[PDB]
A paper describes a structure:
GlxR from C. glutamicum (Cg-GlxR) has been identified as one of the central regulators of the Corynebacterium metabolism and more than 200 genes under GlxR control have so far been identified. Cg-GlxR, which shares a sequence identity of approximately 29% with CRP from E. coli (Ec-CRP), is a protein of 227 amino acids (compared to 210 for Ec-CRP) comprising an N-terminal dimerisation and ligand binding domain, and a C-terminal DNA-binding domain. Once activated by cAMP, the regulator interacts with its target pseudo-palindromic DNA sites with the consensus sequence 5-TGTGANNTANNTCACA-3′ located in the regulatory region of Cg-GlxR controlled genes.
Apo Cg-GlxR crystallises in the monoclinic space group C2 with one homo-dimer in the asymmetric unit. The loop region of residues 165–177 that forms part of an anti-parallel β-sheet shows no density and was consequently not included. The two independent protein chains in the apo Cg-GlxR structure adopt a similar conformation with an rmsd of 1.36 Å for 200 equivalent Cα-atoms (all least-squares superpositions were calculated using the RAPIDO server). All Cg-GlxR structures form symmetric homo-dimers. Nevertheless, there is a significant movement changing the position of the DNA-binding helix in monomer A with respect to monomer B by up to 10 Å (measured by comparing equivalent Cα-positions of the DNA-binding helix in monomer B).
Author numbering:
A (entry chain A): 1 to 226
B (entry chain B): 3 to 164, 178 to 217
């Protein structure tokens, strides 16, 4: 249906790819839905399925023997996950759990081989997608090593707003729905450290802290801090 | 053998060996003096380098203008590799520790290289994924593993072949007040040895 296939076409994997080929793969894709709280996969599990959300929220968490788990990200419409599986079938690098009911469409490595075979020119476009992904994954590594807590709070707030923000009267209302601990986990620091940084941010007039939402009043200043 | 050194490149792991050689013969060789910057953070980038001899440090600009060292690389290492699939501004500086010799290609060569060997396209998507696989593996550990464990990781990774005091602790991620006390404990167990910018591993 138009809107659902509109949502799908927006995914990273299709960004800057041949529009006709994108249409082609979209109609070959299988739909799935999952209920609220459903587990899609567990970290460690073998996989060969890439998911593109068309509706609802999935969280990806990282785990450990000691130092249990850590929210990695939260994802919504047009986002994809599990993409590694279809390029390098192997074990899942995270967990994926449904925060709400979720509707998605999926593919596996075969559908991908067939796809490229049909539209060879897209291999170059998909390498660009795979590299853009890399650019981002190394960045989060660098930030975690070198940026300070306030800085990474600033980053995390901006990243959530890019993905889940509402333009509101010159500001951006971010409706993440996360505990203080989860924000800490995204930032990679302690509930306490992260909460101070937030408070200093409010005190500066850059943000207003309201329930489980953040109103970013001063993007420029907050960004410069990031 | 420059070819062999070049053949040990991550970009080439598990790709058609004839497709690999065809490109090697056709890559440009380049040389830089000691100290020279190859590229600066934020300049338009479009070139992959593979080191054939010498050492290159990669770093990002820090606040207060300070220095943030991301990695040291020697023969067979490649930097700028992402600019070749996804042009645009460089995300680090690459600076020559010694005199440097290296081979290069641009995205313009890479387009022609796939169009000549469509077999590779999939092998190249696998490479990137494997690298992607590796970086998260690094991220998990970083949020989880102890600085000693991460100083042990940096030590083992650089030891492939056998940086100041405030440069190793950048690689590792935490304080030099932590990285050093991690390093001393290792030496007390008799694992490694001081000597200056030099370390001996057992």
């Amino acid at each position: 249906m138009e809107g659902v296939q509109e949502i799908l076409s927006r995914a990273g994997i299709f960004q800057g790819v041949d529009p006709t080929a994108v249409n082609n793969l979209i109609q070959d894709m299988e739909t799935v839905r999952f209920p609220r709280g459903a587990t899609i996969f567990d970290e460690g599990e073998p996989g060969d399925r890439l998911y593109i959300i068309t509706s609802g929220k999935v969280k990806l968490a990282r785990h450990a023997p000691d130092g249990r788990e850590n929210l990695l990200t939260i994802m919504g419409p047009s986002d994809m996950f599990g993409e590694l599986s279809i390029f390098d079938p192997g074990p899942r690098t995270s967990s994926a759990v449904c925060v709400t009911e979720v509707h998605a469409a999926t593919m596996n490595s075969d559908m991908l081989r067939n796809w490229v075979a049909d539209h060879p020119a897209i291999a170059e476009q998909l390498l660009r997608v795979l590299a853009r992904r890399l650019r981002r994954t190394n960045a989060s590594l660098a930030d975690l090593i070198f940026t300070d807590v306030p800085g990474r709070v600033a980053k995390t707030l901006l990243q959530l707003a890019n993905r889940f923000g509402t333009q509101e009267a010159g500001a951006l209302r971010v409706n993440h729905d996360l505990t203080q601990e989860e924000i800490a986990q995204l930032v990679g620091a302690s509930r306490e450290t992260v909460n101070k940084a937030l408070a200093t941010f409010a005190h500066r007039g850059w943000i207003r802290l309201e329930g489980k939402s953040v109103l970013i009043v001063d993007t420029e200043h907050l960004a410069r801090r990031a």
